Amino acid sequence: NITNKLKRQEIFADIKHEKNKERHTMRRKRAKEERENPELREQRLKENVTQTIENTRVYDETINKEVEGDEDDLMRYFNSNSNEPPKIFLTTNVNAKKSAYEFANILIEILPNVTFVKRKFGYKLKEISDICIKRNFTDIVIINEDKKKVTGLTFIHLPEGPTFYFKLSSFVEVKKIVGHGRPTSHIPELILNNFQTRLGQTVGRLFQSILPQNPDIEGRQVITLHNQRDYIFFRRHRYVFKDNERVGLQELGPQFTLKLKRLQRGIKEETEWEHKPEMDKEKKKFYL
């Protein structure tokens, strides 16, 4: 109605004021009535439900669906064998700076039988794949740095296994962490969270394959990959199994964030899944 600035601002502010007065009185009166009766408290909280995005996600049949041929695929495209440990190969991209070398040095301690190389000019990926097959490397990891910042990760299982390109967004070193903790030689346990979609179960089996199995129970260390809203979070922690039944933590090594950008069949052959901003605009799918 009113288009004067100072009139309209004043009027709507006073409407807000009267409204918040009434809301305070109403919640206080309901508080008195629920002092009296603890039933209608429960009847309210069962009646109206606080909507959140975690509550409301677009239904996907990939959620809680079993994987067809999961064991043969799991030995096929993934290294899932207690008999055969993985040879992991660190492949830091051409003309790398110092930052990706530091991150590779971090990633040494994470992954088992890990091997680093410095890439040189003029080696195509087929030639590198052939050499790593002859050396029986089963997976290669490519660090993509840019502007002295590690921005991307690439995972390729070598016996014609699938390509994975993750985008690293936010990285924190160990020294910037307040609750620092000192990691040890002991093999940590691992936590995987919210990988329930079929693509999410694929990525979960990927991280389950790449991470070392057989943890050291003596050295109470764990790592963790949480999935939330197509954002996976890497952290790692130490255990205090308390008498008070809540386990105590200390965030030991570095933390960062990953996001799957590209899931491809084979060694960069055909793309199963990609990320697009037009996928992002729907805001309720959450392709995990």
Partner 1 sequence: MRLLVSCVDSGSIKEVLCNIGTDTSVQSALQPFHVAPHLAEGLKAYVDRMWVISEDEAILARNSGVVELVKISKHLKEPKFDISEFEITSSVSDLFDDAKLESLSSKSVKRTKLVDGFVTLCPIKKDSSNNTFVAATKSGLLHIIKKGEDKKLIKLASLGLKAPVEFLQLYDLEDTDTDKYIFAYGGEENLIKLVEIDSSFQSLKQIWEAKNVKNDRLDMRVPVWPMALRFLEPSPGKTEKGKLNYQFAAITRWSHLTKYSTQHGRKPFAQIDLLPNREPLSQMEVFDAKGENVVSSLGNFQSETFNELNVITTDYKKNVFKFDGNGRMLGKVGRDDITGSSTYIHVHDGKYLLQGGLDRYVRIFDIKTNKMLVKVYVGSRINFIVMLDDVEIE
Partner 2 sequence: PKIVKKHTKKFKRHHSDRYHRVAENWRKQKRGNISQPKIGYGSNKKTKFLSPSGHKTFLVANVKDLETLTMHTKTYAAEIAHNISAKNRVVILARAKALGIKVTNPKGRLALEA
Partner 3 sequence: SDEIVWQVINQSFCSHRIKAPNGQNFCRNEYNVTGLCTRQSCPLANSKYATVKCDNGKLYLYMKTPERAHTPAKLWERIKLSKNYTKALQQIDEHLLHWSKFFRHKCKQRFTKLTQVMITERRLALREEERHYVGVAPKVKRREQNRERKALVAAKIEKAIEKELMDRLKSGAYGDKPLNVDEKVWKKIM
Is residue 20 within the footprint of RNA (CB under 7 A)?
Answer: yes
Is residue 261 within the footprint of partner 2 (CB under 8 A)?
Answer: yes
Is residue 91 within the footprint of partner 2 (CB under 8 A)?
Answer: no
Give helix 5-36 / helix 38-47 axis angle, nearest 10°: 130
8 A C-beta contact, residue 285 and residue 58:
yes
Residue 31 carries which DSSP code? Answer: H
Q: Which stretch binds partner 1 (CB under 8 A): 18-26, 43-51, 65-73, 247-255?
A: 65-73
- For strands 149-157 and 163-172, give the pairing: antiparallel
Q: Which amino acid is at 259?
A: K
8 A C-beta contact, residue 224 and residue 194:
no
Is residue 16 within the footprint of RNA (CB under 7 A)?
Answer: yes
CB of 48 to RNA, least distance (A): 4
Q: DSSP string spanning 78-133?
A: S---SSS---EEEEEPTT--HHHHHHHHHHHHHSTTEEEEE--TT--HHHHHHHHH
Is residue 229 within the footprint of partner 1 (CB under 8 A)?
Answer: no
State which of positions 82-101 bind partner 3 (CB under 8 A): 93-94
Q: Which is nearer to partner 3, 159 or 248 (CB)?
A: 248
Q: For the chain, give the longest Cα–Cα distance.
A: 80
Looking at the chain, the residues that come just before a C–N gap of over 2.5 A are none
Is residue 151 within the footprint of partner 2 (CB under 8 A)?
Answer: yes
20 binds, among partner 1, RNA, partner 2, none (CB under 5 to 8 A by kind): RNA
Task: Please identify which residue in the block is written with the tokens 């979960």.
Answer: 204
Is residue 138 within the footprint of partner 3 (CB under 8 A)?
Answer: no
Is residue 280 within the footprint of partner 1 (CB under 8 A)?
Answer: no
| CA–CA distance, 210 with 187 (Å, rounded to integer) | 14
Is residue 255 within the footprint of partner 2 (CB under 8 A)?
Answer: no
Q: Which is nearer to RNA, 269 or 280 (CB)?
A: 280
Is residue 160 within the footprint of partner 1 (CB under 8 A)?
Answer: yes
Tokens at 102, concatenated? 């530091």
| CA–CA distance, 287 with 268 (Å, rounded to integer) | 21
In this chain, which of 76, 186, 226, 261 binds partner 1, going by CB under 8 A? Answer: 76
CB of 275 to RNA, least distance (A): 15
Is residue 268 within the footprint of partner 1 (CB under 8 A)?
Answer: yes
Q: Would you tell me which residues interact with partner 3 (CB under 8 A)?
A: 52-54, 93-94, 122, 124-125, 144, 169-170, 191, 193, 217-218, 220, 222, 224, 226, 228-229, 231, 233, 235, 237, 239, 241-243, 245-247, 249, 257, 277, 280
Q: Would you tell me which residues interact with partner 2 (CB under 8 A)?
A: 144, 146-147, 151-152, 154, 165, 167, 261-262
